[model samples]
Target: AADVYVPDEWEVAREKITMSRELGQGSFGMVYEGVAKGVVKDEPETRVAIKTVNEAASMRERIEFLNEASVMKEFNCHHVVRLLGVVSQGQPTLVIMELMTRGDLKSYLRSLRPAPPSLSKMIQMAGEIADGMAYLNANKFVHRDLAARNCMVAEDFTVKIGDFGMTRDIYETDYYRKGGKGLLPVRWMSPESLKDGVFTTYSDVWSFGVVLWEIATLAEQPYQGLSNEQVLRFVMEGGLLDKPDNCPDMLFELMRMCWQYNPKMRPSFLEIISSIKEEMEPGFREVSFYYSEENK
Candidate 1:
């Protein structure tokens, strides 16, 4: 048998994981809440989210499952989910990860009934995502997929970069088919990514703009009411999403910068961090126009 993941402490015995409840299902597998016995030396048991593939998964399915684990294992930032280990010893390969109490950003945003997050809180969350992306860029990894649905919300409400199989679920609306291998997130994709299959840190920056819009609009779908073809033409022809109601002008400007047709025009995540930090300062917060709830 071939090694699924790197041979190291990351390999966990299938016997050690006691599957609890089914958390949710992904494209190729199901996630479960599990208790991993002795995954950590100091801890007796660790509560983890276990990702397992389907019973008769194809070679591509198994590879993608392990590839996500391999990519996740490299990132060790505060704003990214931590990978505990992998269970490849048995028939069903498993990828164990840190369990986020609050689930994903998309569902979290929708759950807020009469109120959305405050401007400061929104900026903070945006900062956290950028912080994680900056780390990813520095580490030579391209996310290829970066959207609100992919981010996880921890118990403390800190947004962490993670990917479940949510992308495949949005195929009817968010994803577009190309002559390439798989579906592309047209609404969140950059021109280069849409035209060619080129994905890089800069392309990630483009998707970051859509994520920021999601936060500003309380998880409203991007390019609303437009077909994939229209979205493709609009974005290719220098079109941009309008400033969201009550969204800060500066923030909207950042979004516009990120959506620049030329990838070179987008600001780096480092710059984004600095910009959000400025917004969080006392002077900026004091005079900024707040989102009036009464208007909603």
Candidate 2:
């Protein structure tokens, strides 16, 4: 195991760390609400969020955690979850980050229940998220884990990307686990990533398409009743989740493009953004023109 760091004196002595109950948990880590301490005299306390890696993680897991932290430090964006700092103690490593008051897209969608998002609202949030992803690709970061759960929403409905545990610096190939077989969540993964362990900007695009579908469907889990093995076989057999009923045909086409088997043939994040933008612009114009004409 790599050398583990201990918590600072303040963290150790502090009682009643102001944090909400666990929001969610997965194989990789656990998330909690955290309140930021005043940095200077008279400064107000800022509420933040934190994620901690499981203490019992294997050596490979620990290395992955460290790599995630390094990647988070490198990529900073308002749309992307911000890493405040880290608190290492014993085996579990605690990562401090900006709190998303609205929680993740999954929780938000569940709360919304059966109603899907309005087309305009969905496009708006999708654009913001795509912009954030474009920034990530430009920086050579591959968010190997892009899903509705990893997306967070603010009170104002602004979407922010979260969870860096599966993120990797594309430039540093050796940082990733070469391969052993049968790792990764199959449901939200792109076909290329599933076919071969190879990850790239295009695979990220495919995952984004699934995310858009999740948003349109109000956060329904992809491949909901299938076992992991079943899901993999289905994907290998040219299977894909159907687009949500409310999703537009243009959006559906965009998603199909992302699911292409040839990674090189898939749209880049920038291209995806441009395509969505073009598709959305006419709607905005029609709305604007209609309102103006009605008033006139």
Candidate 3:
């Protein structure tokens, strides 16, 4: 049975619901912190993370919302963000999710003042994030938009994969057919996906490489001045984003392996998680870090 929800009037909605100011706004929608009434008695009020689609959005925009809600509903894992439900009222459509108090990784990175993460700390964070991605991949779900901005961190530094608007249930669809070049953040996309819109598990690995790069570089913007076309051309022309000065060679090699142009050559998310976990063990020391003297 569908849940019965009433949309409060604009003014009443703003006042009745205690929502924090906007956290982040993207092309698809704006995210806010809010509270919703719980269905069960004695469960107290439910704190939710609200994502509202623009009221003036076109039909295409609404489809994105529908896709996001559907995909989110299919996922039920500790590492994945929990979707409470959807609330539709006239022009505005809201996606209610479990509130992540620490916010998204992008904002968390921005809050760090001018200092690179320590090797141990970076590996710990990366491992936690990889665990989340591995869980998703194991469930046959592909996070098409796997970026630092889309990852959320809890107070205990537990990572949760969020932003399902671009996510797809691999078992449910053969391929995404909607076209006309949707607004994609090209810097983080795979070479094949950038060239032909061919996205697969391998393509997702390529995006993971970029996410690794972002994490190592304190979440710097990739290819700041390059347009989508220019970024594609640059990648095809054998250009790769330079690794951070302090990034270990082993980690850089993993990134390179994932960014291979040939999708078949890219490592699976499971392989990635295993590799990272093995390398991060105590007393694990390798000479790979000293192999690259040119970068220093």
Candidate 4:
């Protein structure tokens, strides 16, 4: 019986891993494209991304660095990113995981904007992500940062939720209320998260709405001209960004439902997934777009 993670046989010596190039910096630390060997399994990952902590950081900070790995360790869904293994018994500890070849969703969408994927494809992407979040929500996990930027796209164009550095396991409460100040991604946060420092799956749901807008608009920036503080005030003033230029109204309605003034009023992740799946079904009407160039 393996615990914390499984098959419990994936951990490898730091020396066994080799780096090719840097991927990017994450909230936890630096990440690199790397490969690992010396593992035997029916299904094993040798090509991976390695996220490492700063050696000079305090023990407390590093303590939570692998915390994200621990969170990823619990997930067994295709929508959520999977953890390959970790190197914890050494300095600048490493978290090795499956490498996402297409990179994050935000960038992925942007690259496709010139010739965007079909509406049916984008709806599939949204439904896949919603399916993943629904799994997390059902299992009592809350992804504090659920933006498209934190999501990774596979070569097949599948969107898998990543960046668990801001995730929490909220078993006893519906929210993880913070008491101190720190940097938060302002545009993706919900009113309660910004106004009261409250983090819940509801807030994550709110972020998913923004993520949907990003995908629908081919990765257009939300509140395009507004600064972070301006976005904060806009939300505080009960304002929601207008629908994306090419978004379907049905989908935009879901975004509106997610940004309801009261956190308790937002739809559950399951509801969101079901809604997306329903609309994506064949024979469904009103697939019109705000700007359908293909019609020309």
Candidate 5:
């Protein structure tokens, strides 16, 4: 039986669960969309996504696995992914949570682009992401990894954020720390994160700007070819990628504000949320539909 945590009577025995199909890949685990019927006899079966974390072989992954479980379990907001319960026992440590049916936001956007959702929908989508971020920030949770890939879309079209956070991998070439030279997830990181190890919600603010870029560009990867060194030099000297041809002028401006060098200058999620709402008000056209560039 899975030892359950959280206040929910939703505690489910692992034996009662049956794996259905793998939903997606993870850095440390595999996620499966599954069913739980035996936990409550004659009760309606619960559908959930089970994230497996058995490879806790290293100290780092262990820290990551545990912290993520703890944080995700505590989250109860609508925009934040909901955690149903946990499977903590000799069995594989399974993170059971509400399953999203429409797949992730990144893939959904990618599939629909080149003739994407309407500008109003895009604005609303952006505001929803900002709204979720504001809630996380308000709760004192730091979601250092804020990107299109990190957000999920529900079948009903609601978006929720998850993963708790990341266990920073040193081998990858993004993020600039004084001692490390690597791949530049350059498009998503705040300069301070790359250069000085100064990271916080402010760094997250910087990342959200890149997500906005992804949204406007229909999921373009930032700075595709630049070596880590080149991007470091480029971003340090104020070299942000140009606006996507389809990106509105004001949206790019907000992206720039988030990329500001001084972390303090970056807007808080609350401020960003308010600004997004104001921008979405009548007569302000924020997003315009565009096709993926390749088809052009």
Candidate 6:
């Protein structure tokens, strides 16, 4: 069946989508802004972002692209980008997603520039990401590449986790290994992940810490001035990123907890979210704990 790759509810007719213009590009393929007709209930036309694989790409790339769609289809969180539908039976093998007007969080943070976001604003953004990650963690999904660059910002500055291309399909590959090709996000990875290709929710939490640093520092690169090789050695020697001059002690402490060498010692996403709630509004300590218990 041509419609077999995607489930009945998640399938979209290729003819229904009209590609408008190129939005972005990546190694796997290019993203385009498009309109889908009759895809959404009661909605005649929906503006959507399409990730399309090249017609000449290897089967492996096609599989990986579809794999990303398969992964995104499972999520239904407000803080995570929503997956609209997929066109797996078509030539391009498209993964349609909701459009984010502000683009990637990294670029958004940079645009804020000399007058960056206020402390409260940054914490709010980080809290939104933590909330999304908590949902992902609960569902047993490890976002192998969680960073500012991978997060998208809406017109209202709402940040949602995006770019799931690197998420391993557990059934497809049970064990993780470094590939010879492809650039890795060494700066965002945990010690275990970098050293042994070990990826888990804890490792995602480690990467989240770096994302927090990015938000606080206006999206500056982590471990600045160090090559990937130097970073490997630095991390191997128990080095950790220093707090930015403007980062509060409270936030820095949480970041340190995430960088703990022992993955088990790192706080879970739920715990991180709880911490964020309290920091954002000290009065929320009681309510935060209650919310955490309720989530449990």
State residue 90's C-alpha deviation in candidate 4, in Å.
Answer: 1.8
Better of 2 and 5 by lDDT: 5
Which scores greater on lDDT, model 4 or model 6? 6
Candidate 4: 10-residue stretch with minimal lDDT: 287-296
Write candidate 4's Cα lDDT for 1-296 as tens digits.
64332324556787888899988986766789988875435544478888887554667566666655776777767677788778877576788888899999888878875566767787877877777787787678888888888999988777888886643332213544465445678899899988976888899899989988888888788898999999999997898989877678777998999999899999987777656656454422223121122222
Q: How many backbone clashes does candidate 2 have?
A: 0
State how far residue 76 of model 4 sits from its true place (Å).
0.7
Runs of candidate 2 exceeding 4 Å displacement: 1-20, 38-43, 56-64, 89-92, 166-182, 224-226, 278-296
After superposition, which runs of candidate 5 have C-alpha atoms over 4 Å from their true positions?
Answer: 1-11, 37-43, 54-64, 168-184, 278-296
The digit string of per-residue lDDT tens for model 6 on 26-107 reads 5357899999887678999999998887555567677767766787778877788889998877486888889988899998
> Among these predicted structures, which one has the highest TM-score?
6
Name the top lDDT candidate.
6
Worst 10 residues of 1 by lDDT: 287-296
**Where is the poorest 10-residue window by lDDT in model 2?**
287-296
Candidate 6 — worst ten consecutive residues by lDDT sum? 283-292
- RMSD to native for every prediction? 7.9, 7.5, 8.6, 7.5, 8.3, 3.6
Candidate 2 residue pairs in clash (backbone atoms < 3 Å): none
| Model 5: how far residue 78 lies from native, Å | 1.3
Q: State the TM-score for model 4.
A: 0.84
Query: What lDDT would each prediction earn against the true structure?
Result: 0.79, 0.68, 0.69, 0.76, 0.70, 0.80
Per-residue CA lDDT of candidate 2, range 1-296, in tens?
A: 75543334323213323667686774367778777665223856666676766755566666666556656766556568776666554445566677788988888877877335677777876776776677787777877788888888877777887774553433345554445533486887777677876777887888888888887788787888989988888887889888777678767787788788677888877676666675454443332212224222
TM per candidate comes to 0.86, 0.77, 0.78, 0.84, 0.80, 0.88
Full-model lDDT, candidate 5: 0.70
Clash counts for all predictions: 0, 0, 0, 0, 8, 0
Model 4 alpha-carbon miss at residue 161, Å? 0.4
Error of 1 at 132 (Å): 0.5
